[PDB]
Structure formats: structure tokens, C-alpha cells
Amino acid sequence: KLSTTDRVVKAVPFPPSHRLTAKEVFDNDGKPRVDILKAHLMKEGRLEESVALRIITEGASILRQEKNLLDIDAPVTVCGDIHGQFFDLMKLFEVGGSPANTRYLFLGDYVDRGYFSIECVLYLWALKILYPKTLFLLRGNHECRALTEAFTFKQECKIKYSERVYDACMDAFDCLPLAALMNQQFLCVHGGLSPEINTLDDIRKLDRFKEPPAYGPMCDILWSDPLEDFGNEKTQEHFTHNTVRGCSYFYSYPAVCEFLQHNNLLSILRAHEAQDAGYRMYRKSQTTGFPSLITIFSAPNYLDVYNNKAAVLKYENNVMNIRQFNCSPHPYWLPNFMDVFTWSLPFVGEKVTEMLVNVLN
Amino acid sequence: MDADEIKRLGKRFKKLDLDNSGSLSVEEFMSLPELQQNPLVQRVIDIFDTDGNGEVDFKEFIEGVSQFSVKGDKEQKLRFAFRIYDMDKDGYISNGELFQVLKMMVGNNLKDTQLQQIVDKTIINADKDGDGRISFEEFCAVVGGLDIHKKMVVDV
Amino acid sequence: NYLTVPADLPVITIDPAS
Ligand SMILES: [Ca+2]
Ligand SMILES: [Ca+2]
Ligand SMILES: [Ca+2]
Ligand SMILES: [Ca+2]
Ligand SMILES: [Fe+3]
Ligand SMILES: [Zn+2]
């Protein structure tokens, strides 16, 4: 009948086993060859450990020389959470345009939850090497050690590469800028505002080359959310304890609007919170007539269950163009990268034992 | 094995040998109603069926039940579990049969594409010597520390 | 009976999913 050696479902391509070398990932000038890298990672291809570390460290060196608060001019396509959904990241660049001719800004949460986080890091770091002054990456609350060891990035790295590659990602993440000032109008962060941050200068004075502390302004940038009832304030408090996160704070519509007014800003662009449409426009500020807060979320069908759209903000020609997209197929992993023997063997022992017991009564 | 255990096994064998042919066919196993809803029935029969004639004789039935003995060592229990996957009986779990044996157990709880993908990945992360297949050594290295041998004991 | 998986002002425009 069906072969016992040859693969049953031959329409599925067998993933490549060869690990790409330096010569194959970097061209004659040392520029990453992103087409090779994309094609190879789309097939679940892996790199040699030394090449992976080169991408991470060379990207880190570029990030290490950028400011806490980037100055990014328009036009630019702003993007929210990715959470290891590499194949939606492929779709994302289709929707927003190739980075060869498109300025990009990412607000963090590249890893965890999705099971292609290391591919997201490697490809985005390779783009950052190739386009150091037109593709920008900020830190999210997940680009740290506390979360990657609790969720799945650390395990993913140990499964596909090594803890050394993981450690290298952690040192690289410590270099990620925290915020961007976009076209002199928008503060861009992963999470939001801090009680201890009242000026743009307060972000500039921070020391970011560290694990995120458990409290403080750096924590707050990566962790804060708008109030559940943002804009319908019976609450009077500008900042209150964020009981969803267990740390940092909720910030209110008066809090956001005062910050915008003090610092001469149009809106706050952030991410950090899933949205059914991939974005949310919050109540306009009464002095700007413009949404005080914008959440952008770029991980469609989040966790393979939310069934949400994802979106990016293309800001260009004084138009804020929301571009939505749907999820794309992605190869399957068992939860926590479990192999099929570990998965099924307890069921084998169970059912052969059950059969034998029934055979014998 | 133990004498009295042999007497009892001869009686059950006869009860199951519906056409009194001296050998147990697949049909005769499937007559047991419990076995009807068990997806590994055919795999256990094939392992028991060492001479390959498609049925289980008494020698085969005794040798088969003995591997699940309390005195049996881990390597024996795991060697049995290994043969559940090793359809073609060649000592190595190959891609085609790993998929087939898993499809028997999962049924429709996974699509053929998702199962082929996680099967590919296991073949790849586990094949150390690089011959495209999973030996018993490679197999033990993955599942070894799971204490599955403890659940594979029958009182005859 | 079967194995289971472990359980001045800018305009704002929209391009819906393709
Ligand atoms: Ca018979
Ligand atoms: Ca036989
Ligand atoms: Ca085999
Ligand atoms: Ca092998
Ligand atoms: Fe997130
Ligand atoms: Zn977040």
C-alpha cells in the first residue's frame, strides 16, 4: 500500500536541512542577501550558528548607535506587534511595500506566542543591517529576558539554534530604542505614557542598555495601557495601577491630552493591545481635533484563534492610511515545540495496554 | 513463563479463535468490541505476527503477551513501543510510516498537512546519524526519560 | 479514542483587507 519510507503528503515540501553559511547570507560588500534569507526562512530554513550570531550582533551594533528617541521623518509605515508570526510578516511587507523603497517603523513585540520568533528577529535584523536609516525597530515589553524565558522564545532558540543565539538576542534587545518622534508630530512607543515622563527630554535622559526594570519610566514605556474606559472618564486619576499587566499603569484621556499639549504633539502611536480590526482610533483631543491615541496591531489571527485583522499605518502625503490584512498559512508546530514521539507515546502505551487487558479479560 | 499463566492463556486463545483454526485472525480480534474502537489494534497484531503470515499463533500469542510482563525491563517496553511505529519492521522509524501510524491515532484531529509538517520536523531534529530515519537509539534519546514503560504492564 | 492536540490636519483613510 502506501510507502512506509517515502513521505505520504508529498505536496508539503520537505524543509531544507542545510544551514546557510556566511558566504551565502552576505554578499561581496558585507550587505545581507535578504532575498536568499527570506526564501530560506519561508521554507523553515536555518542558518549556521555563526551566521545567525553575525546578523544579531551586526544589527545590535547599528541599534547601539541610535538614540533612545529616534527622529523619523515621514513618509513611513508604522507597525505593531508581530509575536513570531513570520508568515504574516511576509504578508505585512507585501501590504506596506518592500523596504527597498519604503521607510518602516516597528513598535516591538517581535517574539513570543508565535512559533517563528527567531525567524522574525533574523530577518528584521538583516533588513536593519541593509537599510539602517530607513527601517526602524523599537523595543516592546517582550524583547527582554523576563518574558522570553517565561513564554517561548528562549525554548524556540534552544530548539532551532542554541542558548548562545538566545543570549545574543537578549544583548541585542538591550540596544533597541524605546520611542520615536515621527515627523515632529507623533510619539511612537510600544505601551504608552509614564507618570515619570512629562517631556520628550525625559525619554532622552533614560539609560536603556539594560533589562527593563520592574518599575519606572522605561518599564512604563513598554507596559502602560490606556484605561479600559479611555475617553469616558468618571475616573479623575491620570495614572492608576495596571491590574491587567500587574505592573505599570493605566493612563487616562486627560493624561494623554495634557502630554500632547505640553509637548506640542498631535497623537501617540502605540501597539501592545490586540484589536479586532488590527487598530483602534481613540477619542479625539478637544484641542487638536485628532485622535489622542492610536493603537496599531500587526499580528493577524493572533494566536491562531482571535480571528482578528492586522493593520499598518502608512503615513504619507498628510494621509494616515490604515492598511488591513488577513492571516496567511504557516507550517504547524505542536504546542511548546513538542515532537511527535513525546506527544503520542503516552497514548501508545495507554492503548496497547488497554487492548492487551481486553484481549485477556 | 509461569506454568499456570500458560494454562489460562490457552483458554483465552481458544475463546478468541472463533473458527478453531489454531490461529487468531484480524477479524477474530476485531470481534472483541473494545478492540473495535482502538486505533492501534492492527499495529499490535502485526508486531505479535513475527512470521508475517497475517495471523497470531499460540507461540506468537505467548511471546507477544510476555513483552508486557512486570519483570520486563525498560528496553523491552520501549522496544515494543518503537515497533508500533516501525511498520516495515526494519529497525528504523521512517517518515512514511511515522505519518501513517500517527494518522491512525489522531484521525481527523489534525489535517494531513499539519501532520506531515510535525512529522518532518521530528525526523529532522531526531535523526543524528543523518540517514533520514529514526533508529531505536535515536528514539530512546527523545522519549527515554518519560516513564512510559511503567504503564505497559499486564497481569496474565 | 483518538489522540488530541495538547489543549492641514491629516485625513485618516482605510484600505480594507485584500
Ligand atoms: Ca482462527
Ligand atoms: Ca503469525
Ligand atoms: Ca522502518
Ligand atoms: Ca538516523
Ligand atoms: Fe504584544
Ligand atoms: Zn506588548
Residue numbers in the entry:
A (entry chain A): 10 to 370
B (entry chain B): 15 to 170
C (entry chain C): 682 to 688, 713 to 723
Kindly provide excerpts from the paper associated with this entry.
Next, we created a model where we replaced the CN AID 481ERMP484 sequence with the NHE1 779TPAP782 sequence. We speculated that NHE1 P782 likely binds in the same hydrophobic pocket as that used by CN AID P484; namely, that created by CN H155 and Y159. To test this, we generated the CNAA variant (CNA: H155A/Y159A, CNB). CN and CNAA had identical melting temperatures, confirming the maintenance of overall structure. We also measured CN activity using p-nitrophenyl phosphate (pNPP; a small, general none-specific substrate for CN) assays. Both CN and CNAA had identical Km and kcat values, showing that catalysis is identical for both CN variants. We then determined the structure of the NHE1ctΔ92:CNAA complex (2.3 Å resolution). As expected, electron density was observed for CNAA and for NHE1 residues N682-A688 (LxVP motif) and D713-S723 (PxIxIT motif). However, the NHE1ctΔ92:CNAA structure had a much shallower H155A/Y159A Pro-binding pocket than WT CN, while the remaining structure was unchanged. Indeed, comparing the buried surface area of a modeled TPAP sequence for CN and CNAA showed the NHE1 P782 pocket to be ~36% larger in CN. We then measured the dephosphorylation rate of pT779 by CNAA, which decreased by ~50% compared to that with WT CN.
